[model samples]
Target: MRRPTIELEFDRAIEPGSVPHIALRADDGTSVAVGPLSWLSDRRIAFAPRKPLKSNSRYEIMVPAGIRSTTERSAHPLTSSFDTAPVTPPRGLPNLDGASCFINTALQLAVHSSALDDILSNEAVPPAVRTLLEDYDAASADALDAQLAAAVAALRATPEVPDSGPGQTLEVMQALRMPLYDTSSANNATNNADAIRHAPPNTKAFFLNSYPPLSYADLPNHDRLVAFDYSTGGHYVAYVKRDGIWYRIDDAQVSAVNEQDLLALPAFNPANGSVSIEIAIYR
Candidate 1:
């Protein structure tokens, strides 16, 4: 369903190039441009739409009745339909306050990234994570939080196996498949640079957690998701960018925050009640 592809299996092997002769159309009767055909085997061939189809909409696929297989068998002309899935939900994930902020932080980080869009929507995602994504805005926040807690406790909840308890935020992050490269207790200077260098070729929209939390003057690149303590130890908050605007999403509330206000938070260096700046996730 990610990138829908259509295929046809012939009762007998047809000429390899005969696939191009097939036709596909929208329900409205407009012709659809099909991509280059791929032959999966002697009797099977596949192709995708040159352009994406619409959501909650259907398309008609027409098969050629003329092409004959080596057995001299020809397909009867036929039309069939299929529908696309609904679009993803908008930004601004619901917050489940308390120790649940760790769960909130991980989710906000996951859902807000365009690259991670389909990853959460897919069945391939961890069951708990999928439940939150599919059912968040519509359900009771307390119930969802309890579910995450239970799933985390079981250690079999996420797509990844994170054995320890959720208090260690890094472990939770890793469990969600968010990449990390922390030089533990490492200072702000060489640590970030070193981490970047050690990172894979093209990290984009990565999340960040930092110590001596970043100051207003040290915000990360324009596109990013950040996590930090909310002045309450281990009670971290998430900051995400959407359509160029940033919003602070903490357990208790959500609000738009300017560059300076969000960065110059309680956890910034000369930290307030916070012991260490929470982990920073970034690209």
Candidate 2:
């Protein structure tokens, strides 16, 4: 699907209901409306194209002047225009949850740590002897980072996920590596102790990398497709084309892009084709 959804970032807090109206257009004069539905964070919001666009096609985001961005009592008009990522062929693309277990497992470090910690603390029996396992939690976070870094290092050593070339484009590297970080590791948590097993003290945000979304959006248009999966919620996959061949990414990968703007992949180009974008969300 072309013009799937676009993310908006703000410097200040934005209420859940406040969003600016958005529209996307192509050089061919093809256009569609973009609706804001959920707020990922106080500073971030998401949108899906009301209608799907062509595959391997390029589309632009247009935020109208009339679109109001409301924060507190202040409603400021915003008009912005931007292009979607380059498109790729469908076959090379992965399913909705385009990422692999490797990717999501690493991602759990960021979004799910707090949630998992809450569950662990609230469990009938906690791993930590103290209240809510505060010390345990801190230590586990620290350890998880070191262990995960080891795992990431292993993956990087593999030719499948190559290291960044000298000034080759950091976005490409982020696209290849960040998805692994987004993959959740907690699904493998066998016991409360598993929590402590994966985390490292001073892990720095999410993976040891502390990836930020704004960093993703600024990457040069390579020619690869990154697919992601959201199987737990509904077995959905999001495939983004940056290079000629699409690589299915994981849900955590998408979050990384939305948060850091690390535009590592190429733009979406439907002419190249499409892929199934498989996801193991349902198990």
Candidate 3:
């Protein structure tokens, strides 16, 4: 079948040194190609899709950020951006799945920053104490050990609320439980009690949407909300009656386990057992 061709008309005649390259991306990730722009008139250029895209698929065009003259080796900026329909397909990596890369990098940021803060704040610890840790960029085995220890000490201090509590019903409890912030994707797990239980005082930390702000009086997206059968002792609690063994966890951890993303996976059993986070206003 002949692939369909589309004409792109510009609001104004583009001069050289504006936009250089144009990109066509399909939401379904269909293969595509574009030909050199053939000026049909002062404002219109014609191009063809390498292949006919799937029916009902959505696509977007990168109207040059600016345009470049065809005669020159270099390109120019685009006056505007052109977008196509939004197609929804099964979600997958968008050519950039730096999951592991991002996760480890985030951990390094947390560990190094925490160490710097400790050194700067510790009155009892000497300036020489800073040298005791490895360079911030390097994630040494020792550094990982120290970060894990510090995180554990903090996590062990709190109660993990799985559901909200009565006044603090299990429902309220789950909603109120502090969440850990792992923005950098560093350390696959953490257990910092201070970071999890309460929002940092002097600085702002990130919060997972699982818990609405304390002042959030109403549920905006109830579809995401879950109702647990507390009387049944939630499936989150696993029991191997045959082996006379069961997995014991804190309320927050229980709540996290039920959350699709696994709320707080850093500390299995740390000091406070909860993470602190910052909340933003929806309005």
Candidate 4:
């Protein structure tokens, strides 16, 4: 969120000279350097910083009291604060009927995937994909139903259930012209040194598919955008990690798993057959 433009709105037009009283400050009590005021209208103004802000920091904006408007004065302070961390923690996607089980599963892994981060950026990202995750973060309690609904509904009739699996979801990525490495046939690494493919061909990161029944024990410690299969029918849920914490992301709820307690959970073991890790994406 570097150099983000901030706008302030007033009930009425303000006197011109009072604009200088507006200040942006870091929570540390240091004044931040910024550009001159951008007067959007008589009642609104905006401004942006001149340099990159520190990562994971807090900032405050102060529109001091006593600033005069054409007709009145601001008797109280107009101040606000914002955080500068720019992270998109992967969230659960909406699960629905008509092959949505797999669609949501695939996207749950994909959206969490740092492997696909660059390709998913606003510059190279597919528009629908770009905003879909944003929609989840902004409005979703734990699901993204509407956007995925129209795509699954409006895009060429309901996909055939048998064919509507993760493979086609990968096709959706390819359809957007992004390349992927299919590790479906990849063997589990016998040692940590061999875990990640590391920079798959032309990509910054990669989504890894782990072999079922006792995987990841020997794999390197890394962040995962993971998907688990509930049964032989291929219903997938995201049990992923971002920023050192692991989560069990079913479309209905997001429960954070104590990293130390995850492997011991009865339902987490692929060997149990009730659920199995189908996809273990690593960068």
Estimate the overall C-alpha local distance difference test score of candidate 1. Answer: 0.53
Off by over 4 Å in 4: 1-90, 115-126, 140-143, 154-178, 182-214, 223-233, 264-278
Over all chains combined, what TM-score does candidate 4 have? 0.49
Looking at model 2, residue 128 earns an lDDT score of 26
Where in model 2 is the C-alpha error above 4 Å? 15-18, 66-283
Candidates in order, TM-scores: namely 0.49, 0.27, 0.24, 0.49
The window of 10 residues in a row where model 2 has the poorest summed lDDT is 274-283
Clashes within 3 Å, all models in order: 10, 87, 61, 0
Checking candidate 1 for backbone clashes, the offending pairs are: 207-281, 207-282, 208-280, 208-281, 208-282, 209-279, 209-280, 209-281, 210-279, 210-280
lDDT digits (tens) for residues 116-213 of candidate 3: 34433445332222332223234354664454344332322235322122111222122223123432332332322223234333222333334322
RMSD in angstroms between candidate 4 and the native structure over all alpha carbons:
11.4
Off by over 4 Å in 3: 16-19, 28-31, 68-283
| Residue-level lDDT tens digits of model 1 in 11-45 | 77778655545656654577767878888998887
Query: Which segments of model 1 are wrong by more than 4 Å?
Result: 1-98, 114-125, 134-166, 183-189, 193-201, 205-213, 223-232, 266-283
Q: On residues 188-250, what C-alpha lDDT tens digit does candidate 2 reach at each position?
A: 433222322343432212221221211123221222223222222222234333433333444
Q: Let me know the TM-score candidate 2 reaches against the reference structure.
A: 0.27
lDDT ranking of the models: 4, 1, 2, 3
As a whole number from 0 to 100, the lDDT of residue 133 in candidate 1 is 51
Location of the lowest summed lDDT over 10 successive residues in candidate 1: 88-97
lDDT of 4: 0.54
Candidate with the larger lDDT of 1 and 2: 1
